[PDB]
Symmetry: C2
Subunit: 381 residues, 2 copies
């Protein structure tokens, strides 16, 4: 059941913005590790005396990396005369964010029909304003409200190429890396209390709870009308044998924040081969693979969807497989992206629900907790 | 003339420490870009609740990357009970350094016979103390004095494997990258006034001015007794046609600091081939190459040291060649390592002065300014 209750017209995920200490080094690392190309920049060379911002793209996935310059470069400016290309940027906010959280996501940006309308409707319905609507070069409108912790939900709307003031990068500096990643599937937040977080966000968006199917966590997923913008939120479960990883996140992050980004691949086997080739030469590491008994148990569960060879390929790459009643989910998780055990990345590919593929086909992996434990009985074997 | 006036026994350069916002991403980027292997770590997994530190090595070159965790992880600790492996580390100093300067070198570390003696003699001779001598696990002694700006000269002495509390990394995570770099040749600082900087540093070390052979800068080089520890210092020259790049550095860095590291290669052609292969896939970029007329003019200057083919190879890789009366210097400069136009890297290889190779063989490139301008007359050609 999807009541289609969006209080304003939402299109798709637009970009994810990381707040960094040094945008250059994070962007270069992510580009090599994930196979994303450098596609746009806004920095000193484009006249921006406030922040350095670099955009990586893979298909429709857009990762923006931003870091502040010395405030002294822009000390004469006021907001009416700013050289910042992202008018919501603030030196103090950015330094405070990074000192508090380390490297992480500041903005989850979605494209909407009218960012000014989305902002007004959101705040009228309880959203905490973060940055009011601003029209850039009479062409793009940008506005921000608080999502959870210090993460903002960013609205972007276009009258009719990233943002005004960004330049496409010299293709001599733009190497056409591509490991198969194509779009952001969903973005997951961690909060101390799930109930109030859901009420707040569902309150100002009109997003509905996405229909799904005892260790660590509870969660729920908020979804837009066509269920293409998907926002799961986790809370810790206290008192368990193993300490809740959600609680570990909250401790090391200094509170609520974005936990992970799920990136859709058009070919998850190619993506994982290419990413694993680079893990120890500047790329990303992956979580330890499930035991072989997990893959022995895969035939009974998805032997009608994957061949023996395709299953053996899952075992080689450490891929996890889950399934609801509409589709199948292939997934894998990286180790944390930076120093703290906070943010990480998931790679996914979904099988089924065609007609295009409907959002959330196969779910979010609710069945992989019990399948993993009832598989770690390989201790005996 | 070298008076051999070192006020304490200095051995060689030991390591360079970068202060970062996220040590993981900077270290991974540098590892791939420069061909350095991950060799040691001190972080949460080793019991350090204060800072994350990762060591890269190539030959005898040691690059350490350090970033602070949330202070809350260590809020119960006091200095007597610290879990930091580097006792001079301070959360506030590190965050203040990075907010002020961005990514850069905090410590230039040299090995000495007795770090406690070196510290005492230095401070007795005018050195501003930064961190007093501390004995780690009854095995290593570490002390720090101010060098210039917020950069410290770090003394390390060993009774008899980096530092106690560091662990050698799992060789599954340690890929044996190597593009030919073997040691730190020299480390260059930028200051507003050269005179007082030289007097201060030569004052407390006893380092002497190294014997060498109108645009932008003046400099001088301080050297240890065997001239293996080499510390050039630059000051801006004001009022010139083109604005002094030293002054640009000082503006974007918020004052004095380390400008560049010169890394010796055992095979500069291999190093540059390998680094240039990776420039647009996560590595480092290089300064624009000199015009072909520069290389046309190379035969007359170093045709007795390099073959036509070796000269053509210099032209392919953009290598600069200088020469004093004792040896020849091959060199090249990277673009800035991070967001700000501040720190960069030089790759060098020296030819001559054998007997081992004496320090500074070929100089530091004093002759490449005039050779470059008188070559940019290729405009006519
Ligand atoms: O909310 C969800 O749908 C998740 O899957 C979140 C999650 C997944 C794995 C570890 C911790 C949280
Ligand atoms: O001090 C020196 O020996 C230098 O070469 C410093 C330097 C080199 C190139 C550009 C700016 C400063
Ligand atoms: Co997920
Ligand atoms: Co130099």
């Amino acid at each position: 059941k999807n009541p289609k209750s969006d209080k304003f017209k939402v299109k798709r995920f637009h970009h994810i913005e990381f707040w960094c200490g040094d945008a250059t080094n994070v962007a270069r690392r992510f580009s090599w590790g994930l196979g994303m190309r450098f596609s746009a920049k806004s920095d000193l060379s484009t006249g921006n005396m406030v922040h350095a911002s670099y955009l990586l793209t893979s298909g429709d996935l857009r990762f923006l990396f931003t870091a502040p310059y010395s405030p002294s470069l822009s000390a004469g400016e006021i907001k009416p005369t700013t050289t910042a290309s992202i008018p919501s940027f603030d030196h103090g906010s950015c330094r405070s964010f990074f000192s508090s959280h380390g490297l992480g996501v500041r903005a989850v940006a979605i494209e909407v029909e009218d960012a000014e309308s989305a902002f007004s409707i959101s705040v009228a319905n309880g959203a905490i304003p973060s940055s009011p609507p601003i029209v850039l070069n009479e062409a793009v409108t940008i506005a921000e409200v608080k999502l959870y912790g210090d993460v903002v939900l960013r609205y972007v709307s276009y009258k009719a190429e990233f943002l005004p003031g960004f330049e496409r990068v010299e293709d001599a500096s733009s190497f056409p890396l591509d490991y198969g990643i194509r779009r952001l599937d969903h973005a997951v937040g961690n909060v101390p209390e799930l109930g109030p977080a859901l009420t707040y966000v569902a309150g100002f968006t009109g997003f509905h709870q996405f229909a799904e199917f005892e260790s660590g966590l509870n969660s729920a997923v908020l979804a837009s009308n066509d269920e293409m913008v998907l926002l799961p939120i986790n809370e810790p479960v206290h008192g368990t044998k193993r300490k809740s990883q959600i609680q570990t996140y909250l401790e090391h992050n200094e509170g609520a924040g974005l936990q992970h980004l799920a990136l859709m691949s058009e070919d998850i086997f190619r993506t994982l081969r290419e990413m694993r080739k680079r893990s120890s030469i500047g790329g990303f590491d992956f979580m330890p693979s499930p035991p072989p008994t997990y893959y022995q148990n895969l035939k009974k569960r998805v032997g009608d969807v994957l061949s023996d060879d395709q299953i053996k390929e899952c075992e080689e790459l450490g891929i996890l497989v889950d399934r609801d009643d509409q589709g199948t989910l292939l997934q894998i998780f990286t180790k944390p992206l930076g120093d703290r055990p906070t943010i990480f990345i998931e790679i996914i590919q979904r099988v089924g629900c065609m007609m295009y593929q409907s959002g959330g086909c196969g779910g979010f992996g609710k069945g992989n907790f019990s399948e993993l434990f009832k598989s770690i009985e390989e201790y005996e074997k």
